[PDB]
């Protein structure tokens, strides 16, 4: 149906906008702390601590399968990146501090992304 197609075109356009959001958020992580999944070879206990791991590569795979239906879904995954890191790592660590900075800087980007998603529809 044409209605199915139009819905598909909206998903595609949201996918475009979320790719640009993703790039901008990932630029706020120049150390690449959040670029890849935590390795279970190098942190064997990780899944005892963190039940839903997340990273920018895993978000990028979901994005390219058009797997985010709305901004809320995408933000949930972003927040997992930050929130997981801030539980596993102590306050005095470079990891925790990097999460804080990504959160604070990413807030700005997400604030305008929400306006654009609502505005364009």
Swiss-Prot record:
Residues 9-113 form the Bromo domain. Scaffold subunit of various histone acetyltransferase (HAT) complexes, such as the MOZ/MORF and HBO1 complexes, that acts as a regulator of hematopoiesis. Plays a key role in HBO1 complex by directing KAT7/HBO1 specificity towards histone H3 'Lys-14' acetylation (H3K14ac), thereby promoting erythroid differentiation. Highly expressed in testis. There is a cross-link at residue 41 (Glycyl lysine isopeptide (Lys-Gly) (interchain with G-Cter in SUMO2)). It comes from Homo sapiens (Human). Component of some HBO1 complex composed of KAT7/HBO1, MEAF6, ING4 and BRD1/BRPF2. Component of the MOZ/MORF complex composed at least of ING5, KAT6A, KAT6B, MEAF6 and one of BRPF1, BRD1/BRPF2 and BRPF3. Interacts (via PHD-type zinc finger domain) with unmodified histone H3. Interacts (via PWWP domain) with dimethylated and trimethylated 'Lys-79' on histone H3. The chain holds residues 555 to 674 of 1058 of the full protein. It is found in: Nucleus; Chromosome. This is Bromodomain-containing protein 1.
């Amino acid at each position: 149906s044409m209605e199915q197609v139009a819905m598909e075109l909206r998903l595609t356009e949201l996918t475009r906008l979320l790719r640009s959001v993703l790039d901008q958020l990932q630029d706020k992580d120049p150390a690449r702390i959040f670029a890849q999944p935590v390795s279970l070879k190098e942190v064997p206990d990780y899944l005892d601590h963190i039940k839903h791991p997340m990273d920018f590569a895993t978000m990028r795979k979901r994005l390219e399968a058009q797997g985010y239906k709305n901004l809320h879904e995408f933000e949930e995954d972003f927040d997992l990146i930050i929130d997981n890191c801030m539980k596993y790592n102590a306050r005095d660590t470079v990891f925790y501090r990097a999460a804080v900075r990504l959160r604070d800087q990413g807030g700005v980007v997400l604030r305008q992304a929400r306006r654009e998603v609502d505005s364009i529809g």
